[PDB]
Amino acid sequence: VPANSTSNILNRLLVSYDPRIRPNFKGIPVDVVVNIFINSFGSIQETTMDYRVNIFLRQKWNDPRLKLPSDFRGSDALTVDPTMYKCLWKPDLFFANEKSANFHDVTQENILLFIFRDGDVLVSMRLSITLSCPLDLTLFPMDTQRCKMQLESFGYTTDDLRFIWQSGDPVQLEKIALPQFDIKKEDIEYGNCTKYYKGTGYYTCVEVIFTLRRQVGFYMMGVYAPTLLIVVLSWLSFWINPDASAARVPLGIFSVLSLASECTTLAAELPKVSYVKALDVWLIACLLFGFASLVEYAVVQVMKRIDLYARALFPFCFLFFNVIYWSIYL
């Protein structure tokens, strides 16, 4: 008559209940219905390709060997302690792109299982996983990161187990704030991707694909508008009189030295990634244009009327570089 007496006369002491024989044995595949509930979403490292995320992963399936009889009518949801949580069957999922998952054990175990009157079983657990989504930052200050998280069965083919989403809001998240990125709950489009392995079986899988988008404002008021100002200053270097140039030399060389210092200093705050990004293309094209202004002044000195072509040709190429650059990277 207490809450554990019905469990002890329902399984493991009563008529046989094998906790490793799945429900509907030698029959239809079990349909597990999962829906995660994200708490925190942080530490998206560009040098380890991980991102930590805490989920309230709950999964709800059908167990016909656990139909509650008419011994009590007030309790529709007969609970069970996490002590005997190993005593009844549960689907064996695992995250195929994780690194080190762990449960939470504050003030209690954070697992909770319900058994319903009509045979349904529900499991909620609080996981803190650290997944692995590859960050291909080739468009770094204006890039997107479409990267995902996939739950798969382990040892059960698709004719034994099958994961489906809840189909009404099956993935949620709080009002959170990433340091750099901006998690778009607009595009949260999930989906199945079953893993046909090489001959050995056909294992189920479901996944959620987040679409992170980095915000550009710090880089624009960082190493974009100061660099563009330095390049426009290097253009204004020519406007001093070319006869006996005492100001064209400093107005070129200190702009070039300032841009070289800006590049070699703000190579630090960027993610240490050894392939060519977008910001490096921009900074090196701007440094090359400063050096081209120095070259044009030098061929004016060693040979005049070439500055009249320079002031109308080289910014006319700076605008072409700018439109092709901010048209390919936007």
């Binding site: 554990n4 939470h104 954070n110």
Partner: protein, 339 residues
């Protein structure tokens, strides 16, 4: 007789005490009076959006199946080893990221059963809580770090959390955060999560972190303003020595941009406009505009000299008023309004 044999007679495999059902079952909800007492408050970062607290947590409730009068002991102590044979509320923190107890010499838990059924449970936790902090106005920001205790399985028909009467959150006397100040107005209130399966009890306490502006104001703001003053006194001097004036002037721009580039890698690494990057952009804009107006004066000098003198005087009279209007529209905007 011993208190261990008495507790085995009162609850266990002899009496009728069940460790799975809450007290006064099938009735009113039990009210768990909960308070904390923090010890450490550190590791509050801006790249992980978290902080770390190290609390004592004391929670009292009423267990009607522990009333006894056949023993002179008023407060029966209980060892933390055989502690899983008595009901305890399934409290958990709704925003943690990592939480652990301690076993320094013994277990760091304590249970005391009073005579009137009052149960007191004192544990010692270390938590890595999360808090979403924005850095729109970085060196003049305030943060509200929240701590939300709540139930897990029981709804508000079975478990209700309530703070203590006096001093629900106490702080260890003498804390010092690295780059912050922990204020003494901890707004504690209700949370009351409204999920689909009902409403779960949820209490919370909000701290107050006000970052003090000593090091930023003496290391970045005043040097950048000093380089701005050098930019003004560049073209304040007479325009005869044009290479020397343009030399100092340009060098001043190089000094300002080297100051900004060095001050980049000390700030927190977020990707939006902080209130110090607006400053490091506008001061660089002003030193560049000073250089460009001086270069326009030398482009004029090629109204032979009276125009040059009038341009220099108008620039030297218009830049101070413009910079001070920007200083007002910046400091009154960030310091006063978004306090």
């Amino acid at each position: 007789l011993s208190p261990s044999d008495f507790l085995d007679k009162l609850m266990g495999r002899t009496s009728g005490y069940d460790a799975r059902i809450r007290p006064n079952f099938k009735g009113p909800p039990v009210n768990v009076t909960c308070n904390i007492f923090i010890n450490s408050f550190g590791s509050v970062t801006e790249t992980t959006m978290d902080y770390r607290v190290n609390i004592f947590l004391r929670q009292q409730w009423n267990d009607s199946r522990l009333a006894y009068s056949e023993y002179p002991d008023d407060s029966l102590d209980l060892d933390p080893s055989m502690l899983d044979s008595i009901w305890k509320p399934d409290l958990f923190f709704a925003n943690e990221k990592g939480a652990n107890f301690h076993d320094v010499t013994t277990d760091n838990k304590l249970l005391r059963i009073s005579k009137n059924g009052k149960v007191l449970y004192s544990i010692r936790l270390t938590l890595t809580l999360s808090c979403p902090m924005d850095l729109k106005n970085f060196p003049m920001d305030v943060q509200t770090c929240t701590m939300q205790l709540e139930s897990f399985g029981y709804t508000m028909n079975d478990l209700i959390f309530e703070w203590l009467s006096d001093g629900p959150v106490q702080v260890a006397e003498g804390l010092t955060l690295p780059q912050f100040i922990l204020k003494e107005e901890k707004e504690l209130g209700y949370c009351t999560k409204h999920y689909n399966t009902g409403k779960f009890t949820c209490i919370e306490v909000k701290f107050h972190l006000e970052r003090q502006m000593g090091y930023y104001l003496i290391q970045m703001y005043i040097p950048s303003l000093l380089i701005v003053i050098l930019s003004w006194v560049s073209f304040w001097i007479n325009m005869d020595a044009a290479p020397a004036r343009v030399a100092l002037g340009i060098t001043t721009v190089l000094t300002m941009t080297t100051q900004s580039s060095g001050s980049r890698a000390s700030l927190p690494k977020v990707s939006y406009v902080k209130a110090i990057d607006i400053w490091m952009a506008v001061c660089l804009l002003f030193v560049f505009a000073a250089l460009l107006e001086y270069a326009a004066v030398n482009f004029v000098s090629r109204k032979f000299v009276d125009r040059a003198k009038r341009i220099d005087t108008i620039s030297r009279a218009a830049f101070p008023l413009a910079f001070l209007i920007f200083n007002i529209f910046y400091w009154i905007t960030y310091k006063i309004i978004r306090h």
